[PDB]
Amino acid sequence: SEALLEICQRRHFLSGSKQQLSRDSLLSGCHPGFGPLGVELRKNLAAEWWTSVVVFREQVFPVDALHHKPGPLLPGDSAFRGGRENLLHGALEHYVNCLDLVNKRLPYGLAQIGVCFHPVKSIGEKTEASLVWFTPPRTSNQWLDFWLRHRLQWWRKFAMSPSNFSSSDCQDEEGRKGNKLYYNFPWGKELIETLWNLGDHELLHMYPGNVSKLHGRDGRKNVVPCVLSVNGDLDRGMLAYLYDSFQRKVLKLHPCLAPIKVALDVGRGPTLELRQVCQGLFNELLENGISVWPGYLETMQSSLEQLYSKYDEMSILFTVLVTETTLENGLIHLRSRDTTMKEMMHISKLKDFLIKYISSAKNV
Amino acid sequence: EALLEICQRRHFLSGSKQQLSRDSLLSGCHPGFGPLGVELRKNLAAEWWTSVVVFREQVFPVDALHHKPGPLLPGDSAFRGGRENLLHGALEHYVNCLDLVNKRLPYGLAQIGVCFHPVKSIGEKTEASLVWFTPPRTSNQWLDFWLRHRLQWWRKFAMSPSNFSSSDCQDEEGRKGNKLYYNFPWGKELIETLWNLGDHELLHMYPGNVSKLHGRDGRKNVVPCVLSVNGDLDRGMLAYLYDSFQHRKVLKLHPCLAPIKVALDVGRGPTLELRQVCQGLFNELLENGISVWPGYLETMQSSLEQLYSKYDEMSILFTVLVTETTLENGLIHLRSRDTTMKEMMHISKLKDFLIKYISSAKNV
Question: Quick check: A64 and B33 CB within 8 A?
Fold first, then answer.
């Protein structure tokens, strides 16, 4: 029973009047959408998942699975319009050609990140992140044991209290054996990801006919793969990550995640020169790939308290202020979203600063 | 013919010589893209966003939807919800997300996302659209502003900018707009739309109350002119791929655009102790934001030439080799692509090299 969800509108993480902010609407995927920051938080979040599963470990590749389903369909079932339910289906279909992609060796998976449609009657839109891992029966229980473990330490990575993220085992959906990751929300836990061991089923359903046209070599042993589908919902995550950045107000979000890094403005200074060197910096930063809020284009001052208590209400790692005292040396000063402190620093070092503060937090 | 067939064999597209063929493509019908088609499109994506959405921060990311439940108007062609563009979606923010610049005009809402259109059948198109709101006074100047800009964007990546035509045009729900066309082999095709609509659609969006939409043009409180700009990333991806071809194959595609930049495996060598260095680079480069095709995993050495005609058939800027005359002194030989040149080079000074080859290239 908090207001955090409001702050998500006042600072644009969410859109819509106080009605549409119905925890349902949100959870169930029937909200009107996110505000600029949210988007970024999601775009930001996602890439972090792409770099955490596609980048480094590559012999896994991106797949473009359509949104709707043309042609025929099945007898009844609670489905509307014909658009994708999940991202797995599209993935599978590719399995046979992209199988060439790895000189036909296993294991190997296809990744994608897109929006999926769940009916609730009205529709729902959720941005899920999926990787359909094909496996050699031999090491099938093994990889599941694997990912799960891995995937968990991922989310906990960015948390300010990781232990609210937990794992669980379970069985028989489309086969026994499976896992689930949850985020604990003040009211209760909710599902943010699914990890099942599809076995050679579905796949065989999709490809009736031959058994050889598939089964990619194992270790000289040509065997029909075991479909392992890992599908995690990004909106409900992006949503989870937020409560984790709250209890003053302030949104303590893990840097690499933040919708925007630093924001700069102006203090006891004139104008031109201020928003002179300012322009330069704005460009210096984005140049080096850093999100910056051009506060310096704003009006008055709105005090500094008003200003600080919004930037915090927006999760802006840092808040740097430039005053005429700058143009005579290179002295500006930043206020840490957290340490609420305001050291001073030499502008030109600002650049390499944020770069490493992030470059650091990134490792940790 | 020629090129196309390649785009499948080298996984840029998915499907037989049937599915893939003009109509199927143009008409956003083809079944999809391979892990390469992806990247190129993906690169072309941000490569756009960092050419419009980033800088000039007064342009923000939006999150329109894909369907429109609830009451709307009954007639013409569409599919229950299924968006036809990002514009209507966008507008649904102009009010709320105006409190982002305190009504200060001009200012724009951008978003990239797949839209859907009738072909009956369904055509999917990744669209990049900027919804720019502007004071009646500058409306033209901006339309003219963008056109010239937008155009330079395309010609900038082409290896024959003189195949990228732009033409003036009038009438619609607004006077004046623009069209961008690429010089495919069968004539010209539309890939971009620049329309100065005027407050029209807007007022229909928001009837009755008129002050609720004033934007402070200077000190003035006035209502904006929606200049909608919409390009086709897919139909474009098809352009650049074509503007990079015309046994002499090699897809001479531009760098910060190329799906995979550097390739890599081994020549006159053994294994592992080598494929151990091939993890020292791989892991490095990715860590540096560089696309690398993990050659070394390959098997049957099978021709030194077979690779070059493949890597060229893939469009991989450079191709780097690791042999025995390496491990000892560290020297590794890399090839080119376009320039089909070759050279020695300490394995160390390589990550730096590429980083700049593309880096400087992006500076043109």
Answer: yes
> Strand, helix or coil at A110?
strand
Q: Which of B35, B48, B61 is nearest to B156 (CA)?
A: B48
Question: Does residue A292 belong to the interface with chain B, where contact is any CB pair within 8 Å?
Answer: yes
Contact A321, A267 (CB under 8 A): yes
Task: Give the domain extent around B346.
Answer: 259-364
CA distance B351 to B359: 12
Tell whether B133 and B33 lie within a shared domain: yes
Contacts of B278 (CB under 8 A, 6+ apart): B264, B265, B266, B294, B296, B322
**How many structural domains compose chain B?**
2
Whether chain A has a CB inside 8 Å of the CB on B305: the answer is no
Q: After which residues is chain A broken (C to N over 2.5 A)?
A: 120, 247
Instruction: Mark which of A217, A246, A275 sits at the end of a domain.
Output: A246
CB spacing of A97 vs B34 below 8 angstroms: yes
**How many Cβ atoms are within 10 Å of B279's Cβ, its own excluded?**
13
Looking at the domain assignment, is residue A44 inside a domain?
yes
A198, A229 Cβ separation under 8 angstroms: yes
> What residues of A are in contact with residue B33 (Cβ under 8 Å)?
64
The answer as to whether B250 is a domain residue is no
Q: How far apart are CA A307 and CA A298, in angstroms?
A: 11
Decide if B32 touches A, using CB distance below 8 A. Answer: yes
Residue A253 lies in a domain: no
Identify whether residues B314 and B357 lie together within a single domain: yes
Token representation of residue A338: 């957290």
Instruction: Measure CB to CB from residue B80 to each of A34, A81, A294 and give the nearest one.
Output: A81
